[PDB]
Design a protein around this ligand. Structure first.
Ligand SMILES: Cc1cc2nc3c(=O)[nH]c(=O)nc-3n(C[C@H](O)[C@H](O)[C@H](O)COP(=O)(O)O)c2cc1C
Ligand SMILES: Cc1cc2nc3c(=O)[nH]c(=O)nc-3n(C[C@H](O)[C@H](O)[C@H](O)COP(=O)(O)O)c2cc1C
Lengths: 311, 312
């Protein structure tokens, strides 16, 4: 059994898309709904539509991806209408990611979600980590600013929600981040992690960067990020015992999913690998994770979630 | 054709050296680096008193790199100063020493001891603001107020040009903030980008157990994991600190990666994980591979393409 029971919902399996991959348009979301994924999440949205950064803004790499999309999205009203009128909740639960570029914008957006969450059960993931908007640094790397967002969003939304965090690389930062998150009881899950921000890829043949925005600087995903993701998942799993942790980063196989769950993940998100392979990946992921559990004698994910062994 | 680099008052035969921490802890390590084809070498980050470091296992080689939590094992500052003063053959190549005191008071005492040896022998200082593996000691480089303090106290105590080993940054505001601090210290002549990507976690799916013992399995990542991060940091500081040099460190396994670092702005190129895997023979291979790339492109010197990465 791959089932996950959290937030009052039954999820058929722990897999979903990472925000931003296969979730921007109505057709994208249809394809995620029809897939074997246990859930799905809408593109991080803004109050008004955006077309995003200029091209080229995505480059697939042997070890993953680099991107600077720039939050292209159809605007909050599109995703709310999708959540209210279009999505088939009998197939699977639905998350929406919101990434207002100011606390005021984020507050306006979540207020609109309230009635739809109440009526339909739509779940909010507040994005505190977009690394690709020029002039808008990651909110999650300023703990005073993070505290402000969480306060104002908690007050405006007033229902349980989650947060998408940037990756941290210092034990003191894990402690400081957890201290802020633990002051907000409505934050019921933490998604670790967003892209490793502001990497640079250069093509040796033409001596040129591979993406146009920000002088070539963009978010890294895929195989580059697995050990970082696992560390963040485990660090918050241990520091935030009354919250759930969702794993995101470097998942290409059931084995990586198993590691995320062992580190403490309740749901497992798939970005770069899904971009590479398409939504058929979720069928493969379910099969591979089931095999591993079968071979190890695990009847349910609860038997090993967060049970990574240390020396 | 030439791989020569003229910086810091020296002619380096080529841009390659070890990354601090790899093949540089013992006298025997340092001899092997000196005998290698490397353009330079740097001593293990040291502390005022000797350290044996963390318990085993504390290093694990990976298909895409390495994870470690060594814990700053080193023979103590007096050993490296004595190596620099009496043992090192400067006719072979210049010497850097890395210092990583666990408090600013410790660093000040260490750099004061270095002053006369730098004056006499020309030994170069790299101040480590980024060790991610000592429990309870966060990266100084991730606190810009603390960084300003270290740089003020070390500038005042040492009083000669030196460099800094920085942790990797992942946010444009952080590049801006880091550069604003570094640009206030004229004695900071070079910036080495980057130290390990800190506090990664590797788990073996077969036994469900982490692969290193210290810090519940959390350790710094090196190798293929870090190349795009290293290139970004190199280029970000190359642009923001035009009065300083940048050294590249991270993800170098071949002449191709070295070429990319130099294109991004690197004056010297440091090799960590790949050197740990291959041994000091790697430097001969790197020189050959970089020259081959230059030959194919029609470049005669590094100066022809250093910092000339193109954007769109
Ligand atoms: C093309 C692309 C678009 C993305 N857009 C978003 C987004 O809108 N919101 C968000 O929280 N993360 C976004 N990310 C980050 C992913 O959600 C994910 O955190 C990251 O790619 C790491 O997972 P991976 O290793 O599976 O790619 C995006 C990633 C990619 C590659
Ligand atoms: C075994 C080991 C020991 C290290 N010790 C140090 C050290 O003492 N001082 C330091 O500044 N960096 C240290 N590092 C970081 C490396 O100098 C380098 O910044 C990092 O490994 C990235 O380069 P690479 O990708 O070539 O490994 C160490 C790395 C390894 C693998």
């Amino acid at each position: 059994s791959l089932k996950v029971n959290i937030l009052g919902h039954e999820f058929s399996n722990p897999f979903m898309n990472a925000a931003g991959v296969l979730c921007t348009t109505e057709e994208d979301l249809r394809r995620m709904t029809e897939s074997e994924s246990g859930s799905l999440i809408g593109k991080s949205c803004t109050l008004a539509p955006r077309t995003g950064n200029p091209e080229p803004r995505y480059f697939g790499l042997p070890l993953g991806s680099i991107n600077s999309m720039g939050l292209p999205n159809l605007g909050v009203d599109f995703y709310l209408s999708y959540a209210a009128q279009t999505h088939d909740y009998s197939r699977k639960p639905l998350f929406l990611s919101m990434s207002g570029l100011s606390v005021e914008e984020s507050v306006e957006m979540v207020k609109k979600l309230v009635p739809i969450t109440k009526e339909k059960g739509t779940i909010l993931e507040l994005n505190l980590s977009c690394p690709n908007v020029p002039g808008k640094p990651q909110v999650g790397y300023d703990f005073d600013t993070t505290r402000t967002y969480l306060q104002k969003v908690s007050e405006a939304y007033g229902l349980p929600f989650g947060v998408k965090m940037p990756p941290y690389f210092d034990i003191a930062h894990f402690d400081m981040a957890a201290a802020v998150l633990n002051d907000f009881p409505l934050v019921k899950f933490i998604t670790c992690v967003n892209s490793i921000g502001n990497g640079l890829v250069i093509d040796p043949a033409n001596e040129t960067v591979v993406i146009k925005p920000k002088q070539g600087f963009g978010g890294l995903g895929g195989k580059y990020v697995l050990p970082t993701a696992l560390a963040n998942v485990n660090a918050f799993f241990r520091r935030c015992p009354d919250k759930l942790v969702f794993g995101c980063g470097g998942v290409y196989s059931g084995e990586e999913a198993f590691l995320h769950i062992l580190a403490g993940a309740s749901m497992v998100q798939v970005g770069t690998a899904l971009h590479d392979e398409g939504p058929i990946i979720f069928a493969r992921l379910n099969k591979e994770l089931q095999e591993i559990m079968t071979n190890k004698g695990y009847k349910t994910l609860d038997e090993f979630r967060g049970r990574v062994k240390t020396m």
